[PDB]
Amino acid sequence: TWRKWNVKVNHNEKRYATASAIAATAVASLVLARGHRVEKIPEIPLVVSTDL
Amino acid sequence: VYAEDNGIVKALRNVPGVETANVASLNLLQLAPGAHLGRFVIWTEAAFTKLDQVWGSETVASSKVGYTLPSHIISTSDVTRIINSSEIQSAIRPAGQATQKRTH
Amino acid sequence: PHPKIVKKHTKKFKRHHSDRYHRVAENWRKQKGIDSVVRRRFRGNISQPKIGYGSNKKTKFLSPSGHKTFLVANVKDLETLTMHTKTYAAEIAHNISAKNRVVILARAKALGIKVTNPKGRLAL
Amino acid sequence: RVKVHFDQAGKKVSRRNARATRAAKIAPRPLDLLRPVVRAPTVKYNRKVRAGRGFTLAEVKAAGLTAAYARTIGIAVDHRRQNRNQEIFDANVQRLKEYQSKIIVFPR
Amino acid sequence: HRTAPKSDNVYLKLLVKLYTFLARRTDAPFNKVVLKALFLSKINRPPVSVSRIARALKQEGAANKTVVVVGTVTDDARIFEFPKTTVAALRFTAGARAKIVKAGGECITLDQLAVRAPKGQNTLILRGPRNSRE
Amino acid sequence: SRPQVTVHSLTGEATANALPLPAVFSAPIRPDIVHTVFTSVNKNKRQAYAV
Amino acid sequence: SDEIVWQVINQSFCSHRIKAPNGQNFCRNEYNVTGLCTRQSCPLANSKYATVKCDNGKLYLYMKTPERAHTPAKLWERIKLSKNYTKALQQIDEHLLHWSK
Amino acid sequence: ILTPESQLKKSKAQQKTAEQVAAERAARKAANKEKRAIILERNA
Amino acid sequence: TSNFVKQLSSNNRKTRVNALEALKKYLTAKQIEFNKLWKGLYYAMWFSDRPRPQQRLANELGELHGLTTNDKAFIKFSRGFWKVMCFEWFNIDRYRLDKYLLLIRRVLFSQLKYLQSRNKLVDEYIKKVLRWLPVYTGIPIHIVDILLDEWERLLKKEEEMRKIAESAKKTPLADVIAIFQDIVADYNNSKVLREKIKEDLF
RNA sequence: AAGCUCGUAUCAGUUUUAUG
RNA sequence: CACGGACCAAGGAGUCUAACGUCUAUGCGAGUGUUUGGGUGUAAAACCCAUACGCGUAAGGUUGGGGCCUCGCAAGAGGUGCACAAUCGACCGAUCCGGAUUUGAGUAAGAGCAUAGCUGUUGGGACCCGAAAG
């Protein structure tokens, strides 16, 4: 059980990967190249009023 | 995504597949489901605005202490626009056939 | 059309001593015994696989009738072949039911694609 | 032999819970005790200032309250510590005076 | 005697995809130098502390040259006095970044260097110190 | 890019409001890094096992 | 910008891609010409694109451009096309004008 | 009513090259047709 | 101004069109203001369709110059253009360079058609172009050839005598080409654009 | 294998030529 | 020669970790490391971070010399020359009275830290199975 089950990852760098992950939520052809029938959404980033 | 929960999360918690995250966190595993980029986000209006506070731009500083978003190695991502530019195309000898002609 | 299709070697390679023993199977494997006859290539023994048998990049992967093979499940999948009816021919992965095959059939003749394995699971 | 702590996830949850009960009874009080401001030894660290154990007799006196009462008002007292540095003494006294002025006390 | 950089990093794959081209059509030596020094490893790209730049511009005509470092530029506080220059390289330590732009200079990626100076006309390429490591 | 974004109502139509882009959408995409950070970060929830 | 969206599609996966037994790999997108996702046919990394597609009616030429790139719900423009094969072809190479060959 | 203007610069530079080479075509006809003389007289 | 910038950038057709209108009814009534207007427009061109309108605007932003006071107003107002455009130039797309080269033309032609009014003024116009031709050598390449051709577009066989009388005047162009010869004769420059000029001076 | 500081302008299980 | 094999099925042997490495990638860069600990949590995850501590931070003259610039269609010619190479001056901890030799991957202008990956040495049962005694 003392097999390493976990990995330490630089913090700064990890924010790098978060930053990028958000960025791809924009380009709107990455939203397709993953999954996501999005073709009928009105606009991207799809932004809905706070009222939700 | 949202910013401050006024009671959304309970509405969506049941409905299949849908899932929310406060902006203060943004779970990578829910942005990039398997390292295939691009979750499909519905930001809300407040959170979208929060999103400068969180990360920060040339004006608003950080809120994640001592941080800045990454730089760029290129200036501009799309390359062909460099190469098919008039600004290179005047520096370079002319072209070939792109499919040569079998000799002998 | 296409060139004339040449296999360079048409006989499946077998594993040394496959038949004299069952505890040995027919899937080719190397001989690491430095004494062995099949490794040092003595006359009259079986023929190793070796790269030179590699077939002709033009006709490689071509089924005999001249098309290639592309393996489809539902009709929405064969619609990718609207363009190439002259190169690829498509056949129907085994687990498809007898319910949907007949659909892939009708629609696959309309498009004019060759289905290598019709008559699978279908009577009249 | 080899101990490997897989509960560093859980132990912190039970430590949050512990403090969550210790404030489920004592609720008005602040879980804690006022503590002096104390300079460290050893030419290496002496420039740093630190948390100590308890204020003192004297620091408690000149701050206008008495030991045995202090301990019950939230202060914490350490009887084996010796006030010398004027400045440290000052910051302490001040820190109490503060604490006094900020607290309340209920009746009985 | 190499082909493609060791890297996963997309953006120097688009650089490389640019500089192969440029090197091929323009047939200038500049491109072969810069590219042929791009594919190197991380040990082989010593970072160039900006004090070495300030050293380098102390020669003649150096007012007009865009000095170039394939590596990263890393500022050094051992200089308070820095020229007006224009630098192009891959990565800038934000320290160096703000140091130059404060001092009057300009700092721009390799792409923009190509667009500006495809022949690499009137440029300079500094190699970071090499053996100083183990 | 785009200078600004159109909020939508819950009925789904447009709205007079407009929002700048956060300029986090200017940041590089790095399918590499996402892939490494996401193998390492994905490993971090594992209950142990042994025999 | 687009070349990146490509390279992402050329290393990670598209939701849609096939990889036939020989080396070549289709693209099952509803909207594309040629049905092979490669640099110049994959509708997801182009930003300028045109195909032809049946409605169950006649064959609408669908077109897109960069400008509706961010507005997918309506991005593809659409045109019908005549029943004159001749006139059709003239309509096609009509609308496409300096769209590349 | 439609001027694409990207293709213009190309059509000019293209054109100039094509008629720079057609030079080398004719001049190369003169070159070769010349050679088939000298080399012959020297074979004799 | 901010309401202009944002009603032009607002991504929709309507808000953009009607914001154009208003600005026309406006400029009848400093450097920073003008920059802001540009970036407004620059993003108002970003959107376009089906190229006929894509042209129609290129006119529009041309016409917009047609509106020693206005001397100053529109010399500064164009300085804004050349600055914002050579700045936000190189971050453009590959496919858009269509529009912004077209527009870069209709503009330059519109600065001329104004400065053709009566023709000092001109000298200061070259006291922006001078300030500006000599970064991103992509654009001078364009204004060189398009310079001369579009100029011939102004003055509109014997027609060539109509020009070469009118251009036989040759003074404004004499000073323009004086700006080119300025940039060539120097020693530190593109080394490309130099060559390209020496193609198109001739 | 790796670096670059060569493809420099590098030699050779060889013959010669003069000195054993 | 000598050892194994009657045959079939199934099982069956370079693993894990720790300490030092070499390389490659990655993030930052005179810094460098969030994860003992706090806070928050949609709860063994994600996100945030105070104070410390680990490792690092102790310009000469010439000559050649990738690139560059100029002339030259061209070979070549002239100028500037980064890396380091070498040349003879230099500063420093240790050399007998500023020196006779040196000095130490010391300064002369930094290059490191951390994680991943392939691997290598060492101990752990350490590729699997089999020594007698104690």
Swiss-Prot record, chain C:
This entry carries the following GO cellular component terms, namely:
cytoplasm; cytosol; cytosolic large ribosomal subunit
* Biological process per Gene Ontology, one example term: cytoplasmic translation
Transmembrane residue ranges:
none
Q: Does the keyword Cell wall biogenesis/degradation apply?
A: no
Keyword Phosphoprotein assigned to the entry: answer is yes
InterPro entries in UniProt: Ribosomal_eL32, Ribosomal_eL32_CS, Ribosomal_eL32_sf
For this protein, the record's SUPFAM superfamilies field holds: Ribosomal protein L32e
User: Which cell locations does it reside in?
Assistant: Cytoplasm
GO MF annotations for this entry?
Answer: structural constituent of ribosome
Query: What highest taxon heads this organism's lineage?
Result: Eukaryota
| Assembly information from the UniProt record | Component of the large ribosomal subunit (LSU). Mature yeast ribosomes consist of a small (40S) and a large (60S) subunit. The 40S small subunit contains 1 molecule of ribosomal RNA (18S rRNA) and 33 different proteins (encoded by 57 genes). The large 60S subunit contains 3 rRNA molecules (25S, 5.8S and 5S rRNA) and 46 different proteins (encoded by 81 genes).
What is this protein's function per UniProt?
A: Component of the ribosome, a large ribonucleoprotein complex responsible for the synthesis of proteins in the cell. The small ribosomal subunit (SSU) binds messenger RNAs (mRNAs) and translates the encoded message by selecting cognate aminoacyl-transfer RNA (tRNA) molecules. The large subunit (LSU) contains the ribosomal catalytic site termed the peptidyl transferase center (PTC), which catalyzes the formation of peptide bonds, thereby polymerizing the amino acids delivered by tRNAs into a polypeptide chain.
Q: What's this protein's family per the entry?
A: Belongs to the eukaryotic ribosomal protein eL32 family.
Q: Which PANTHER family match?
A: 60S RIBOSOMAL PROTEIN L32 AND DNA-DIRECTED RNA POLYMERASE II, SUBUNIT N, RIBOSOMAL PROTEIN L32
Curated annotation (Swiss-Prot), chain E:
Q: Name one GO molecular function term.
A: RNA binding
What domain of life?
Eukaryota
Q: Which GO terms describe its cellular component?
A: cytosol; cytosolic large ribosomal subunit
What biological processes does GO assign it? Answer: cytoplasmic translation
Q: Does the keyword Cytoplasm apply?
A: yes
Cross-link annotation Glycyl lysine isopeptide (Lys-Gly) (interchain with G-Cter in ubiquitin), location: K102
What does this gene product do? Answer: Component of the ribosome, a large ribonucleoprotein complex responsible for the synthesis of proteins in the cell. The small ribosomal subunit (SSU) binds messenger RNAs (mRNAs) and translates the encoded message by selecting cognate aminoacyl-transfer RNA (tRNA) molecules. The large subunit (LSU) contains the ribosomal catalytic site termed the peptidyl transferase center (PTC), which catalyzes the formation of peptide bonds, thereby polymerizing the amino acids delivered by tRNAs into a polypeptide chain.
From the Swiss-Prot or TrEMBL record, give the protein name.
Large ribosomal subunit protein eL18A
> What organism is listed for this UniProt entry?
Saccharomyces cerevisiae (strain ATCC 204508 / S288c) (Baker's yeast)
Gene that this sequence comes from: RPL18A
Span of the entire protein shown here: 15 to 148 of 186
From Swiss-Prot, chain F:
- Give the modified residues of type N-acetylserine: S1
Q: What is this protein called?
A: Large ribosomal subunit protein uL4A
Q: Which family does it belong to?
A: Belongs to the universal ribosomal protein uL4 family.
Q: Where does the record place it?
A: Cytoplasm; Nucleus
Its gene name is RPL4A
Q: What else is known?
A: There are 2 genes for uL4 in yeast.
Can you state the subunit structure given in the record? Answer: Component of the large ribosomal subunit (LSU). Mature yeast ribosomes consist of a small (40S) and a large (60S) subunit. The 40S small subunit contains 1 molecule of ribosomal RNA (18S rRNA) and 33 different proteins (encoded by 57 genes). The large 60S subunit contains 3 rRNA molecules (25S, 5.8S and 5S rRNA) and 46 different proteins (encoded by 81 genes). uL4 is associated with the polypeptide exit tunnel. uL4 interacts with its chaperone ACL4 and the nuclear import receptor KAP104.
PTM note says: N-terminally acetylated by acetyltransferase NatA.
Explain the purpose of this protein. Answer: Component of the ribosome, a large ribonucleoprotein complex responsible for the synthesis of proteins in the cell. The small ribosomal subunit (SSU) binds messenger RNAs (mRNAs) and translates the encoded message by selecting cognate aminoacyl-transfer RNA (tRNA) molecules. The large subunit (LSU) contains the ribosomal catalytic site termed the peptidyl transferase center (PTC), which catalyzes the formation of peptide bonds, thereby polymerizing the amino acids delivered by tRNAs into a polypeptide chain.
Please state which portion of the whole protein this structure contains, as first and last residue out of the total length: 2 to 52 of 362
The highest taxon in the source lineage is Eukaryota
Swiss-Prot record, chain H:
Species for this entry: Saccharomyces cerevisiae (strain ATCC 204508 / S288c)
Q: Tell me how this protein assembles.
A: Component of the large ribosomal subunit (LSU). Mature yeast ribosomes consist of a small (40S) and a large (60S) subunit. The 40S small subunit contains 1 molecule of ribosomal RNA (18S rRNA) and 33 different proteins (encoded by 57 genes). The large 60S subunit contains 3 rRNA molecules (25S, 5.8S and 5S rRNA) and 46 different proteins (encoded by 81 genes).
Q: Which family does it belong to?
A: Belongs to the universal ribosomal protein uL30 family.
Q: Where in the cell is it found?
A: Cytoplasm
Question: What role is this protein assigned?
Answer: Component of the ribosome, a large ribonucleoprotein complex responsible for the synthesis of proteins in the cell. The small ribosomal subunit (SSU) binds messenger RNAs (mRNAs) and translates the encoded message by selecting cognate aminoacyl-transfer RNA (tRNA) molecules. The large subunit (LSU) contains the ribosomal catalytic site termed the peptidyl transferase center (PTC), which catalyzes the formation of peptide bonds, thereby polymerizing the amino acids delivered by tRNAs into a polypeptide chain.
Domain of life per record: Eukaryota
Q: Where is this region: Disordered?
A: 1-21
Q: Extra info from the record?
A: Present with 101000 molecules/cell in log phase SD medium.
Protein name (database record): Large ribosomal subunit protein uL30A
Q: What is the lineage of its organism?
A: Eukaryota, Fungi, Dikarya, Ascomycota, Saccharomycotina
Stretches assigned to coiled coil: none
